[PDB]
Structure 1
Amino acid sequence: GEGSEALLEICQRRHFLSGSKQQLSRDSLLSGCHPGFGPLGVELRKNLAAEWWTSVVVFREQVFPVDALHHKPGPLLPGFRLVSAETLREILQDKELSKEQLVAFLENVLKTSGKLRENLLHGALEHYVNCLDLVNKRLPYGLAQIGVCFHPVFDKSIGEKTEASLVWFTPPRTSNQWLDFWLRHRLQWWRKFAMSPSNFSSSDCQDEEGRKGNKLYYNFPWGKELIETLWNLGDHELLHMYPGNVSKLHGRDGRKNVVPCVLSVNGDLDRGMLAYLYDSFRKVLKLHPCLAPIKVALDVGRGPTLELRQVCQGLFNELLENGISVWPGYLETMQSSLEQLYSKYDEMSILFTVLVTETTLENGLIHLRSRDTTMKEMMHISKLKDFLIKYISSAKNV
């Protein structure tokens, strides 16, 4: 479930998800076959990606972004195939279609086939030499990327997921230490924004070859679904991708040259967004201030329409210039009771609701309501921007 059904209904109604209830099942959401995300979901994903980038890329002096193509054009691939429809139409233009010509066309289509990427590891490993030259051969260093990966789905359907990947190049001796450090850092990052950090857990696992690895789960109401995995892949993939001389693969740590180990950290941002939505859920979605899509809601009371609209427009422009998301609720021609507006904004994870009346024109006091406390508080309109920005900054710091 009842809670899951209510949460999905609220998300669809409040423009978090999209589509009808038929395609909004748990399996469709988890497999990446959902029709899409609403604007609030897009904003939440952008906030989560910004937080991940700040906590992984910005604050690290040896982590750099990497750009990887969605398709990998490669012939003679060992072991879905992208085929241009223009070539098919051109072939269908010729009505002969002999046996030999069609067999040759099928062979050419097969081995020239551009695979859709299933992970960002290959593209990051493709930039090993150039990015190593960027850091002037000073191990350790890493490459981070946020993008969309394609996964086949059985039942045929296509499932795409947004993943944030960090590929860490480390000397062999400190590989386990760096793996533990990254595990702790990622677990702390996931627990930071959660109201119930205990639902985020970690586990130890080993691959088929025996390589050490770790997995991070989230405790959904129906069970635990993996959200991030770490692997100690060694140097097998790097050596395979660069056959021949190993001098170019040498990394300098201290005063010695060695082929670095490969550490892969892959996390799913869509499932993380879903987990945070479940954590947030009186029907109020108590999202973290650093992740809430819309923070401030502006409304009007009763009185001179023109002056109230002008004051609301000025405050809206000031808040936009100060980098605060505001819901333009003062343009609503229809009038609704304050209880309904408060319920709607609580369902939309609105941090504060601000209404402007004739008293604001008289002295300059506006009614401020907090989502967590549900208590009104008169405040002067001059320092509202400072209060909001310091609220967000202090919430981020703690």
Structure 2
Amino acid sequence: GEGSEALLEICQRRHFLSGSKQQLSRDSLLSGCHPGFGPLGVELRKNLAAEWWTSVVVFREQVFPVDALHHKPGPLAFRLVSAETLREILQDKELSKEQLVAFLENVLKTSGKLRENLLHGALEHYVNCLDLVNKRLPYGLAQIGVCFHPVFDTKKSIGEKTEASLVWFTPPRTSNQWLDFWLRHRLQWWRKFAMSPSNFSSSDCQDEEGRKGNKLYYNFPWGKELIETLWNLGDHELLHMYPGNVSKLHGRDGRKNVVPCVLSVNGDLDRGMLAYLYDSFQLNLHRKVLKLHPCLAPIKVALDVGRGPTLELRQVCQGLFNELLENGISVWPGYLETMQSSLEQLYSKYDEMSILFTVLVTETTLENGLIHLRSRDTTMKEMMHISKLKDFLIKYISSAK
């Protein structure tokens, strides 16, 4: 497993996962209690979130995404206690044993909890969104965000995992049809951006009440990890969330009024981010190059400069940077590197960073028309004019699918 650690030192060096080597342990990164990611890691999370938002909300008509509050308020994982009230209680020396016990019991019985499962948010907003969709069924409410989980440490700890969830309220007649359809669509989404989607697997699980859902995994170099889960929870949770009459809790399917149903998805995006990291690097002369797919790689264009007329070269590079930024691409402003590093070392750094193309602006650009362009996929040079080059890049992104 040296290559797994050799990837980890690259993922630490070139600003993907924040921290030091001591906390660079498998359980720390896999358990959601990670010490943070780098800036490129945050942009990779944003790219994954953008692709999920296209796949789920943009290209599906009935998905109206919703946002529920971060903490679940009491009465009733973990509990929260304010510092000011604790200070007031502790500073009151006149308090006896019984009053402190009563205060502690009240706190334990009136504590909000940081959320774990986002199903309750949709179960809260369902009536309002039923008013929204003009009672058109099926539909669903989506959301991405960080959830809070206990850490079962063998040595208390809170692990933060970013989760994208959607509660597809469906008619009960066509429940498993939608379940199979969503399994196919989301497994296609998790297989769309991979070097080897054979490592992405699929298995089915059965709930205690007879409900059946599917589980997805990734063949890591040390065993599978759960990357998404599905559970068609029926209608027990929604009925439990609104006791009484079922006048509000209903809907229309075609011409038949029916009680809705519950489907769920739980996508640990951080787990998938590390999974795609392990998918990019696959373990003659070795070339330590991260082969991220050309839609999720965090920085696309690399722009540099050579020795010479630094005023005019810097003007050209700054203009090119602003021109590309106006067209939505992201460039790494490497032209300010006065500390002259070799093109071999610069390319090695920019190829560990999973950058799509490296654009080299030499004096010959100021001579006639030519800029160098080296592709990460081929590591072979090319010449281009500036005026064409922009469009090349954008169609490359448009050709990701």
TM > 0.5 fold call = yes
Taking the aligned partners of 2:27 and 2:99, their CA distance within structure 1 comes to 43
Taking the aligned partners of 1:367 and 1:302, their CA distance within structure 2 comes to 15
Taking the aligned partners of 2:224 and 2:54, their CA distance within structure 1 comes to 27
Cα deviation for residue 345 of structure 1 reads 0.5
Cα deviation for residue 383 of structure 1 reads 1.1
Superposed CA deviations along residues 176-195 of structure 1, whole A, max 9, x for unmatched, are 00000000000101001001
Q: Is the 8 A contact 2:194 2:276 kept in 1?
A: yes
Where in structure 2 are the equivalents of 1:183-202 lying within 5 Å? Answer: 183-202=183-202
Cα deviation for residue 38 of structure 1 reads 0.3
Cα deviation for residue 100 of structure 1 reads 2.4
Q: Report the more deviating stretch, 367-376 or 96-105.
A: 96-105
Taking the aligned partners of 1:2 and 1:202, their CA distance within structure 2 comes to 28
Taking the aligned partners of 2:62 and 2:77, their CA distance within structure 1 comes to 36
Q: Aligned pair in 2 of structure 1 residues 329, 174: CA closer, same or farther (>3 Å)?
A: same
The number of aligned residues is 394
Taking the aligned partners of 2:74 and 2:253, their CA distance within structure 1 comes to 34
Q: Is the 8 A contact 2:77 2:150 kept in 1?
A: no
Q: Is the 8 A contact 2:215 2:228 kept in 1?
A: yes
Cα deviation for residue 120 of structure 1 reads 1.0
Q: Is the 8 A contact 2:302 2:350 kept in 1?
A: yes
Q: Report the more deviating stretch, 85-94 or 177-186.
A: 85-94
Name 1:95's counterpart in structure 2: 93
Superposed CA deviations along residues 161-214 of structure 1, whole A, max 9, x for unmatched, are 000001100000100000000000001010010010111111111011110100
Q: Is the 8 A contact 2:77 2:113 kept in 1?
A: no
Cα deviation for residue 302 of structure 1 reads 2.4
Cα deviation for residue 93 of structure 1 reads 2.2
Taking the aligned partners of 1:395 and 1:118, their CA distance within structure 2 comes to 34
Cα deviation for residue 99 of structure 1 reads 2.0
Unaligned runs of 5+ in 2: 282-286
Q: Matched residues, percent identical?
A: 99
Q: Helix, strand or coil: the match of 2:355?
A: coil
Q: Aligned pair in 2 of structure 1 residues 192, 79: CA closer, same or farther (>3 Å)?
A: closer
Q: Is the 8 A contact 2:280 2:290 kept in 1?
A: yes
Q: Is the 8 A contact 2:138 2:253 kept in 1?
A: yes
Q: Which runs of 4+ in 1 moved over 6 A?
A: none
Superposed CA deviations along residues 56-104 of structure 1, whole A, max 9, x for unmatched, are 11111100111111211122xx592101010001112211121221122
Superposed CA deviations along residues 305-346 of structure 1, whole A, max 9, x for unmatched, are 111111000100000111111001011110011000100000
Where in structure 2 are the equivalents of 1:226-305 lying within 5 Å? Answer: 226-281=226-281, 282-305=287-310
Cα deviation for residue 266 of structure 1 reads 1.0
Of 59, 82, 85 in structure 2, the residue corresponding to residue 84 of structure 1 is 82
Q: Aligned pair in 2 of structure 1 residues 79, 120: CA closer, same or farther (>3 Å)?
A: closer
Q: Helix, strand or coil: the match of 1:46?
A: helix
Cα deviation for residue 228 of structure 1 reads 0.3
Unaligned runs of 5+ in 1: none
Q: Is the 8 A contact 2:195 2:279 kept in 1?
A: yes
Q: Report the more deviating stretch, 105-114 or 173-182.
A: 105-114
Taking the aligned partners of 1:46 and 1:335, their CA distance within structure 2 comes to 32
Q: Is the 8 A contact 2:162 2:270 kept in 1?
A: yes
1:311 aligns with 2:309: no
Q: Aligned pair in 2 of structure 1 residues 353, 274: CA closer, same or farther (>3 Å)?
A: same
Per the normalisation by structure 1, the TM-score is 0.98
Q: Is the 8 A contact 2:114 2:148 kept in 1?
A: yes
In proportion to residue count, which structure has more strand? 1
Of 115, 124, 129 in structure 2, the residue corresponding to residue 131 of structure 1 is 129
Per the normalisation by structure 2, the TM-score is 0.97
Superposed CA deviations along residues 84-136 of structure 1, whole A, max 9, x for unmatched, are 01000111221112122112211221121011101111112111100111111
Q: Report the more deviating stretch, 343-352 or 63-72.
A: 63-72
Q: Aligned pair in 2 of structure 1 residues 46, 79: CA closer, same or farther (>3 Å)?
A: closer
Q: Is the 8 A contact 2:77 2:149 kept in 1?
A: no
Taking the aligned partners of 1:232 and 1:320, their CA distance within structure 2 comes to 44
Taking the aligned partners of 1:373 and 1:389, their CA distance within structure 2 comes to 19
Cα deviation for residue 258 of structure 1 reads 1.0
Q: Is the 8 A contact 2:290 2:353 kept in 1?
A: yes
Taking the aligned partners of 1:237 and 1:160, their CA distance within structure 2 comes to 25
1:215 aligns with 2:220: no
Q: Helix, strand or coil: the match of 1:28?
A: helix
Taking the aligned partners of 1:310 and 1:364, their CA distance within structure 2 comes to 16
